[PDB]
C-alpha cells in the first residue's frame, strides 16, 4: 500500500510513501505535532489583567467585589514572558519557548518535553504554565501575602473547586483528561473551531490536522491492531492527506457546477476504473450490484469521496451548516447507487445522521464548530467524519453564530504561529 | 403570658439532693411544668464487647417527690421551669440558693416547647 | 545530648504538661498485675498472652534493614494480639487531657498507637506492651480515679459536670467511691470482675487543680499564659507564611 | 398469532372506532383509509380540560403566566381526535396524559425502586469476623444481626412512619444456611424459582450469601442515586458494630468495616463520562442485562415472547421516558416514543407472528429449550428479520389506524425492529443475533417506506449493523452487557427499551433463570416491593388510573 | 405539675422563638430543608442576549419588547412541560408542576421598563440603590432568565436535570414565539447557547472519584451559597448576614451533601460570640466592623491574630462559665466548630477579606486545641491542620479565594462541621462591606423572587418553620396518588 501525498494546492509533496510509514506511532512529524499539542499552552494576559482589575474571575458571571488588583500585565508582558520562561524551563537552553503573541495581550508557553516524559499525560503543561504565571505575577507586582488567592484565581479560575480551570485564563488545545468519553479519547477532544482557527481557515489544512488528531486518538484507543492498522491508514492517507490528489482532483472537476450526485459519480467512476470494485451481479431491471475487491481500499475511497463532497457542497453554499447533510447523503446515495456500504460501513453515515440532528434541533450540540472527536454525537466514526466537519467550518463565510473567533480566539491567535500546524500536510510529508 | 427558666447546677445532682430539691419546688407557686435533663442511666451495657450486661447505677434511685415515686433514668443536671409570673422567678431562684449546696446558673427564655408538635 | 523541654509555659499547667509528656510522674498508688489484667477485661487474669501469629523468632522475617535495626518489642516478639486501654478524662481539672495523655504514651512507650478524641484517648498496642502502658498510667498521678478511668464503651462524661461528690460521671459504673476510696469493679467494657480493685483515695480538688493540665478560667486560665499564647501565635504565623511562600 | 392479532384488532376498535371523552370518534372502519378531522381543540379530552382549568387557576393564584393552550402556535392541541391508549396484554384503557412519567406514580416508583436498591456481599465480612476477630458467626448471630440491620437501616433518627419502605433481606446459594435463618429476612431461591432455574442460580452464585438493601425512598428522592451505597454502607457498619458486640475505635475492626461496607458491593449502574456525568445507580449505567434481571417476568412465566415483550415495555419506559426523556432532555417528555412498545399490541402481534413463523420453519426453534435453537448465521437473521419487517409493514399498510396510531415514524420503526430482533434472538438464542435482526428490520423499513424516523433515530441504526459483531474496543459487547452508556446508544430514543427485550429474549427462549446477573434476579425476586416487577406493563396502567400508591411521600411531615 | 425526663435537650433555633427536637432538624423529617435544596437544585440562569444575537443575525428578526412579552408568555407556558409547536402529545399536569416559572432580570433599565412587569425581577425595586448600582455595573446592559423547573422533575431526577429541561423549553419557546422553523441551524445555536454558552449553573460537575454530578451540593461553591441566601439584600447587619449564611450552609452541606451541625444554627451561642467579636473590633480598630469600604482595616497577620485569639478566648470563657450545650453524649466537636466560625466571621468582618476569616478559623481551632487538649472526633483535625497553611498559598491545588472554594475543595472534601463556617466567612467578607453580592450577581438577583416556597431571606427561620410542621413544600403527588 503506497500512496502519494498532495498539498492543498494540488502539488506533489512526496512520491511512493508507504502507508505504514505514515502511522501515528511511526511518523516523526505526527509525533511532533502530538508532542506540541501536549506541551504548548496559551495564556490570556489581557484576560488576567481584566480579572485582576475588575475581580471578574472564577467562571461565568463570577466577580469578587472589593479585591481588585491593578497590575499592568499587558504593558510589562515581555518581562512576564522572561520570568515565566525562567520558572517553567527545567534546564537552561532546553525546548522551553515562551513567545508574546499579538502585542502583549497573550502568551505562548511551550513547556519542555522533559515535563511530558516525566509525567503521565499532558496536564503538566497547563498546571506548570498557570503556576509560572501566578508566581511571576506575585513576584514582579509585589502582591501582599493576603492577596495571593486573588492573583492565583485570576489564572486558575475555580480549580480545584472545579475539575477544570473554569473561569481561568490559561488553556490548551486539549481539554482535561477527565472529560474523555473513553480510553484514549483525549487526542480526539479538540473542537472544530480550534482546528479551523489553527490553520487560519484552510480547508484541506483543517481537514488534514483534524484527521491527524483523530487517527492519533484512535491508534491510542486500540483501534489499529492487525488489519485495522492498514484499514485506518488507508482512510487517513486517502481522505486527510490527499492521497494521489484524488480529493483535489474531484474538487476541481466538480467545483464550478458540481453537486453531491456528481461527486458520487466521480468516486464510483474512479473506483471502477482503478478496480477497487467490480460488477458482481446484474439484476433483471439492469441494476448492477457491485462487490468490493479491496474492502479497506473501498472504505478509503468512500472517505475521500465524503471529504470531497463536503468541500463541494459547503463551498458552493459557503455555509458550514451543510457538512452534516453532505456526510449523510454522500454515503447514503453511494450505497443506493453502487450496492456497497458507505464510508466506515454506515458509521460515518450514522455519525452524519446524529450530527445533522443535533445541529438542527432543540436537543443540544450546536453549530458544526462545537463538535469534536470526543463529542458523544460524533465519537463513532473511526476518524473519517470529524475531518469533514473541521474542513466545513474552515470553509464557512460568516454564516455561523458561534464563529471561530467567539469560541477559539485565543487558540487561533496563539497556535496559528506554529508552522507544523498551519501546514499539517507538508509536516506529515 | 408565662416565662420559663432553667437551673444549671455546677455539679450533676445526686438523687438525694435532687430528691429534696424537686420535692419542694412542686410546693412553689406558679409552676406549670418542670423538666429535668441530664446524662442517661442505662440498666444494661448497650455497646462494646460487654454488651447486654447488668448495670445498677448508684444514681438510679426511686426519688420520692410529692408522694410520687419516680425512677430516675438520668442524673438531673438541668432543670427547666414554667412560671406564669415573674414574681415567682424570684421565688424559684431564692429556693435554689438554700438547698443546692454549690454554685448554679439561672437564665430565662423559651426552653421547653412553646410550639405545637405532631 | 539535646535536653528536651517538651512544652512552653511558666505556669503550673506548663510544669504539669511537661511532667505528663516527660513521664516524670509520681507513683501515687499501686495496683497488682492480676488486678490490672482483670480491669482491662481483655482476658482471664493470670494466663499466657494469646497470639495472633507465631513468634518472630520462628515466623521468619524479610531482609529489611529496619527490622534488623529496630528491636521488636517483647509483646510483638511473642506475636501477642493487639489490644487497647481507653481512658476518659474530665475537663474539670482532671490531671490529664487526651492530647497530653497521648503525648505521654507516644514519648514513653515503643510500639504504641495512641488515638485522641474529644472524650477518649485509646492506646492500642500488643497486649503486654499495652499492659505496661496501662499500669504506668493507672499507677501514677496522670490518672486520678475520681477524675478519670478506663472506659472501653460509652465514654460519655468527660465534659459533663462532675458528680456532686467529685467523681466524673459514668453510665456503666466501672468505678465509684467506696468508703472514701476508688474501687474499680468492672472491665473497661463494663462487664463485672470477680473482685474489687482499690485505686486509693481521690485527690482533693485543690491538689487536683495543682496537678492538672487543663486550662480553665477558675484555675490558671489560658488568657494570661502569655507564653503559651505566644507559642501558638508563632506556630500559626509560621504556618501561614510558609504556606504562602516557604521562606 | 391469531389470538394476539385479534386483541390488536380489538385495541384498534376501542381506540379509533369507539369514542373517548368527547372526541366523537364513534363509528368507523379500522381498515379504512379516510377520516374527517373535527378540530374540537384540547377541550375534547376532558382530562385536558382538567389541566387547562388547573393551569388557569394557578395563573391567577401565583401571578405569572403558567399554562395557556392558546400559546400553542396556530391552533390549540387536538385538531384531530384524542384517542386513548391500551396497555399491551391488558385491558386498562389509559389516556395519553396519564402515561407521562410525571403524571404516573407507578412509573416514578419503578425508577425509585431500582435507584434505592443495593446488594452487598456478605461472605467476606463473616470470614473476617471468624478469622481475625474470633467472634464466630452462627445462624442465630446472623438472625440477630439482620434484625439489627433491618430497622437501623431505616435510620435509628429517620421518622418511624416516613421510612416504612426501608428494609433489608438476604439470599444465599448455601441451601443449608438459608434453612435456619428467620424467613422474614430471607429470599429463598428454592421456592421463588423452579427447580432448574434455582439450580442455575445456585450454580452461578455458588455458596455465597448476599444482602438486598433498600434505603428509604424519600432519601433517594432528596439526594441522588449515589447516596444509596453510602447509606447502605453506614447502616451495615452500624449493624455489624451493634450486633456482634464489637468496640468502635480499635484498628482491627476497621478491616471488618471495610469488608462489610464496600468490598463486595454490587451497584445497579456505574459512572458515566463527562457530558452525561452521573454516578452509580442512574439509568445511564444500568446495563441491558441488569434491566432484564430486575424484571421478574422470567421467574414467573414460561412464555419466552411474553417475557421479552414485558422487558421491552419496562425498558422503553425507563430508558426513554425517564432517562432520555427527563435526565438528558427534559421538556414535555418522550412518553409517546415509549408507549409504542407497550401499548396497543402492535409489537405483541408482530412478535407472536414471528414466533409462529420461526416454529413453523425451524421446527419450533422459538419454543423453550436450549438444543432446538438454530445456530446464529446471516441467513437465519436475514430470513427472520425480513419476514418480520415485511409483515409489520403489511400490517401498517393494511390497517390505516395502526399507522395513524404510531403517527411518527420513530414509533413504527421501533416496533418493527423490536419485533424482528426479539424474534431473531428467540430463534437463535443469541442476543447479538437479535441486534442484527433489529438493524436489518430498520433497513427494510427505510427502503420500503422512504422514511425511517426522526432526524437522528438512524444514528445507532446506521452504526447498528456493523458494530453488532465487532470485537474492537469501543465497539462490541454482548448485548446483555450493553446499556445507555454504550457509545452508540447514549443519546437516542426508541431503541434502548427494545434492546433490553432483545437480550432477555436470547435467554428467555432458553428457559434461563437470569440474563446477566443472578444477584439481581434474586434481589428483586421479592413480592414485598411497592412495585411489581413480575409484570411492569400492568404497573404503568395501574399508575395511569390513579390506583398506585408509591413510597417517599412526605404527607406526614407536611401541613394538611 | 408534670415532671419531664429527657436526655436530649431540645434545640431552639438561633435568633427565633422555636425549639425543635433534635430529630426534627434531620433533612428526612424537615420539609423546609428539602424544599431549600430543591429550590437551589431546580434553579438555573440562561442569558437572552446571545440567543437574541442569533435570531437577529441568522433569521434577520427584530427583537422588540412586545416580541419579548409574547416570548416570555410562551416560555412560561412551555417551561412547566407543555407543547407549543406540534400536536397530539401529553403535557405535564399543571397541578404537579405549578412551582415552575421563568423571569427576566436585566441591567438595561429601559428594557426592564417596557417589559411586562410580571416576568421581570426589578433590580432597583428589590435592591437598595447602592447594591442595585453595583449589580447593574457588574452585569451590564444584558438580560437574563431565571428558570425554575418543577420540583417533582428535580426530585425524580438529579441536579443535572435543570439545564437540559430549561434549554429544551427555551428552544421550543423561541420556535413558537418567533415564527421560525421547527428544525434549523438557528434552533441548534439557541440550544447550544442555553445549554452552555450562556448558562449559569448553581454548581459545577464533580470529579470522577466523587460519584455524583452537576448542580449537586458538592459543586455549589461558597460564593454561590452566599449569593443564594438573600439576607445581604434584606438587612444591613454585617454579622447577621454571615450568621444566616453559616446557618444555611451548615444544613445544606453537612446534613445533605455529607449525610453535629445543628449547634451552629441553634441556642444563639455563635451569634453571641460573633456580636461580642464585632463589638471588640469596633472598640479596638476604630469601628471597622461597621458597614463600609474605607473603615475596614488592611488584613495582616497581627490583626487576624488579635481578633482570632480574642474571639477564641471569649468563647472558651463562655463555655467554661455556662456550658449548657455540652453533656450531649457525643463529645464537643460542635464547640470547636462554633468557636472557629465566630473567629472567622469576626476576622472577615474586621478585614473585609475572606481568607483572613479562614485564618481566624484555623487560629481559633489551634487556640482551642492548646487551651483544652480536645479538638473533636478522629476526623475533623485533618482539615484544620492542613488548611491553616492553605489559606494564603497560591499553589495549584491549594489556594483559592474562599468565595471560589466549596465542598469539592480537596481538604474540605469529606469532613463535616466545617463547610457552613466557610460559606459564612465568605459571606461576611463582603457583608461588612455592604456589597450587593459575594461572587455572583446573577445568583443574587435570580433568588430575589418571592414566589419561592422557601424564604431565602431568613433561611434559619425557614428551618424552624419546617421543624414545626408548618412548611408546605412543592412536588407533592397527591393528585395522582390514591386517597
Ligand atoms: C421542534 C421539533 C424539532 C425538535 O428538536 N423537537 C421537535 C419538538 C419537540 C417537543 C415538542 C413539544 C412542544 O411543542 O414544545 C418535544 C416534546 C420535546 C420536549 N421539549 O419535550 C418533542 N419534540 Ni418532536 N416529538 C415527537 C415526534 C416527532 C415527529 C413527529 C412526526 C409527525 O408526523 O408528527 C417529528 C420528527 C419526525 O418526522 O419523526 C418531530 C419533530 C419535532 N420535534 C419538531 C416539531 C415538528 C413540527 O413542527 O410539527 N417530533 C414523534 O415522532 C412522535 C412523538 C413526539 C414526541 C412527544 C412524545 O412522544 O412524548 C415529541 C418530542
Ligand atoms: C448531545 C449532548 O448535548 P450537549 O452536547 O450537552 O449540547 C447531550 N444530549 C443528550 O445526549 C441527548 C438528549 C436528547 C435526546 C433526544 C432524542 S435523540 C447532553 O445533554 O449533554
Ligand atoms: O425533529 S427532530 O427529528 O430533529 C426531533 C424529534 S423528537
Automatic annotation (TrEMBL), chain A:
All residue ranges annotated as the Methyl-coenzyme M reductase beta subunit C-terminal domain in the record: 184-429
S-adenosyl-L-methionine keyword on record: no
One GO molecular-function entry: coenzyme-B sulfoethylthiotransferase activity
Root EC class: transferase
Keyword match Isomerase: no
Signal peptide (residue range): none
Pfam families for the chain: MCR_beta, MCR_beta_N
Keywords linked to the UniProt accession: Methanogenesis, Transferase
Any Gene Ontology biological process: methanogenesis
Domain of life: Archaea
Ranges for domain Methyl-coenzyme M reductase beta subunit N-terminal: 1-182
Catalysed transformations (reactions): coenzyme B + methyl-coenzyme M = methane + coenzyme M-coenzyme B heterodisulfide
InterPro entries listed in its UniProt record: Me_CoM_Rdtase_asu/bsu_C, Me_CoM_Rdtase_asu_N_sub2, Me_CoM_Rdtase_bsu, Me_CoM_Rdtase_bsu_C, Me_CoM_Rdtase_bsu_N, Me_CoM_Rdtase_Fd-like_fold
Pathway in which the depicted protein is active: One-carbon metabolism; methyl-coenzyme M reduction; methane from methyl-coenzyme M: step 1/1
Swiss-Prot/TrEMBL cofactor(s): coenzyme F430
EC number from the UniProt entry: 2.8.4.1
Subunit structure: MCR is a hexamer of two alpha, two beta, and two gamma chains, forming a dimer of heterotrimers. Hexamer of two alpha, two beta, and two gamma chains.
Family: Belongs to the methyl-coenzyme M reductase beta subunit family.
Name of the protein: Methyl-coenzyme M reductase subunit beta
Organism, as annotated: Methanosarcina acetivorans (strain ATCC 35395 / DSM 2834 / JCM 12185 / C2A)
UniProtKB/TrEMBL annotation, chain B:
Keyword set, alphabetical order: Methanogenesis
GO biological process: methanogenesis
Superkingdom of the organism of origin: Archaea
Protein name: Methyl coenzyme M reductase, subunit D
Source organism per UniProt: Methanosarcina acetivorans (strain ATCC 35395 / DSM 2834 / JCM 12185 / C2A)
Lineage, top ranks: Archaea, Methanobacteriati, Methanobacteriota, Stenosarchaea group, Methanomicrobia
Gene name linked to the record: mcrD
Automatic annotation (TrEMBL), chain C:
Pfam families per record: MCR_gamma
Enzyme nomenclature, EC number: 2.8.4.1
Record has DNA repair as a keyword: no
Keyword Transferase recorded: yes
Cofactors, names only: coenzyme F430
GO biological process, one term: methanogenesis
Any one Gene Ontology molecular-function term assigned to this protein's record: coenzyme-B sulfoethylthiotransferase activity
UniProt pathway annotation: One-carbon metabolism; methyl-coenzyme M reduction; methane from methyl-coenzyme M: step 1/1
Keywords: Methanogenesis, Transferase
Signal peptide: none
Catalytically driven reaction(s): coenzyme B + methyl-coenzyme M = methane + coenzyme M-coenzyme B heterodisulfide
List of residues binding coenzyme F430: 118-119, 154-156, 158
Entry similarity comment: Belongs to the methyl-coenzyme M reductase gamma subunit family.
Oligomer status and interactors: Hexamer of two alpha, two beta, and two gamma chains.
Record-given protein name: Methyl-coenzyme M reductase subunit gamma
Source organism (scientific name): Methanosarcina acetivorans (strain ATCC 35395 / DSM 2834 / JCM 12185 / C2A)
